[PDB]
Amino acid sequence: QDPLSCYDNFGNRDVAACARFIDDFCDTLTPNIYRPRDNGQRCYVVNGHKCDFTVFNTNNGGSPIRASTPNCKTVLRAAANRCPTGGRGKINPSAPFLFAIDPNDGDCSTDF
Amino acid sequence: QDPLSCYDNFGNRDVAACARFIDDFCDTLTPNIYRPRDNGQRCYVVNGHKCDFTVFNTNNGGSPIRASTPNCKTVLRAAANRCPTGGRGKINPSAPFLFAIDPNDGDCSTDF
Numbered sequence: 645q646d647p648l649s650c651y652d653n654f655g656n657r658d659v660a661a662c663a664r665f666i667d668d669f670c671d672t673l674t675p676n677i678y679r680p681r682d683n684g685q686r687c688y689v690v691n692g693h694k695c696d697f698t699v700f701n702t703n704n705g706g707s708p709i710r711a712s713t714p715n716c717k718t719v720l721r722a723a724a725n726r727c728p729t730g731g732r733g734k735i736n737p738s739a740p741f742l743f744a745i746d747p748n749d750g751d752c753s754t755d756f
Numbered sequence: 757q758d759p760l761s762c763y764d765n766f767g768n769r770d771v772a773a774c775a776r777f778i779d780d781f782c783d784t785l786t787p788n789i790y791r792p793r794d795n796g797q798r799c800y801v802v803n804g805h806k807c808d809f810t811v812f813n814t815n816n817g818g819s820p821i822r823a824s825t826p827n828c829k830t831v832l833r834a835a836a837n838r839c840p841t842g843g844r845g846k847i848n849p850s851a852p853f854l855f856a857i858d859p860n861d862g863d864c865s866t867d868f
């Protein structure tokens with residue numbers, strides 16, 4: 645979990661409501677192959693708001709690659725423990741994947 | 757592919773650049789179990805823009821369920837054939853999942 649960056653303190657919503665989905669998200673979306681600069685996401689509804697998860701290949705080029713499931717879990721647990729309004733990070737600075745855990749206003753039926 | 761509705765929204769990105777990801781999206785995201793009103797998505801970069809895909813459990817309740825992989829492919833291929841700017845729909849009016857294919861401005865690095 646380096647870098648690990650918290651979202652700003654102006655958010656309404658607390659990451660504690662989202663941490664229960666970390667295993668489900670990491671288990672289901674990290675085995676996929678992601679081209680450079682592509683992402684995969686899930687949205688989960690909770691009481692009063694939603695939880696948005698992201699896995700993102702930060703590489704600019706190179707081969708499409710799958711992500712590490714245990715690194716996803718390590719990073720997102722660190723964000724849930726250190727960042728009350730959610731956060732994002734990598735397992736170490738040379739790693740290609742970024743993982744994010746983001747509590748947000750609204751629901752999962754919007755933007756499509 | 758009923759209901760099947762085209763996007764009609766001032767965007768001028770052609771769905772034809774996104775159709776190449778239909779199989780990859782459906783194959784990777786439909787085997788996941790989704791709670792009622794939850795979604796999964798993927799974003800793919802293409803020349804000049806991006807392609808946003810969604811699978812969404814429209815049920816209000818019931819137990820979490822997975823989606824049909826061939827139904828996902830039928831609905832998205834219908835939208836790609838009938839909707840030049842993308843679209844969204846269900847396999848028939850009683851089915852729980854909605855699938856969407858959305859050629860959009862931008863990249864896959866925004867809002868996380």
Ligand SMILES: [Cl-]
Nearest residue numbers: 752753754814
């Ligand atoms: Cl709705």
Ligand SMILES: [Cl-]
Nearest residue numbers: 757760834838
């Ligand atoms: Cl049709």
Ligand SMILES: [Cl-]
Nearest residue numbers: 760761762763
């Ligand atoms: Cl329509």
Ligand SMILES: [Cl-]
Nearest residue numbers: 759760761762
């Ligand atoms: Cl409609």
Ligand SMILES: [Cl-]
Nearest residue numbers: 756759761844
């Ligand atoms: Cl509608």
Ligand SMILES: [Cl-]
Nearest residue numbers: 753812814854
């Ligand atoms: Cl809907």
Ligand SMILES: [Cl-]
Nearest residue numbers: 753814815816
């Ligand atoms: Cl509704």
Ligand SMILES: [Cl-]
Nearest residue numbers: 833834837838
């Ligand atoms: Cl058709």
Ligand SMILES: [Cl-]
Nearest residue numbers: 757760834838
């Ligand atoms: Cl027809």
Ligand SMILES: [Cl-]
Nearest residue numbers: 833834837838
């Ligand atoms: Cl037709």
Ligand SMILES: [Cl-]
Nearest residue numbers: 756844845854
């Ligand atoms: Cl709709």
Ligand SMILES: [Cl-]
Nearest residue numbers: 759761844845
């Ligand atoms: Cl529709």
Ligand SMILES: [Pt+2]
Nearest residue numbers: 759761844845
């Ligand atoms: Pt509709």
Ligand SMILES: [Pt+2]
Nearest residue numbers: 761762838839
């Ligand atoms: Pt149409």
Ligand SMILES: [Pt+2]
Nearest residue numbers: 753814815854
């Ligand atoms: Pt709805």
Ligand SMILES: [Pt+2]
Nearest residue numbers: 757834837838
């Ligand atoms: Pt048709």
